[PDB]
């Protein structure tokens, strides 16, 4: 079914949230990445913080017909140049196993998080 491709971050955006008591910023990481149909090709982007990150890994290991597939994946957990490239390409690379797994990537969970349903 769905063919993942060229998935990448391209960048952030940085966004304010109220918490009730005040507004604060937080950094939002641009996903972009291609569907391909058959000589149809969709462009999708997506913005999501570390903490859906994180999030979309528990709601996949919290299901066993699904933790089982990504036991051996590196995935997030809880200036300075290198650490932003060393977290931007270990989400990346997190969601390129995800999808290369079809159980995974055809997942709802995947598919909503990165907004393809």
């Not at 913080?49 to 290991?61: A, V």
């Amino acid at each position: 079914p769905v063919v993942i491709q060229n998935l990448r971050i391209t960048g952030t955006i940085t966004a304010r949230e109220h918490s009730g008591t005040g507004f604060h910023p937080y950094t939002l990481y641009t996903v972009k990445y291609e569907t391909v149909l058959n000589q149809q090709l969709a462009y999708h982007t997506v913005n999501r913080r570390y903490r859906e990150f994180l999030n979309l890994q528990t709601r996949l290991e919290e299901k066993p017909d699904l933790r089982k597939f990504i036991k051996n994946v590196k995935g997030p957990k809880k200036m300075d140049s290198d650490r932003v490239e060393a977290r931007k390409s270990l989400l990346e690379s997190f969601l390129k196993q995800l999808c290369a797994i079809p159980e995974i990537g055809n997942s709802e969970e995947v598919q909503e998080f990165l907004a393809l349903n």
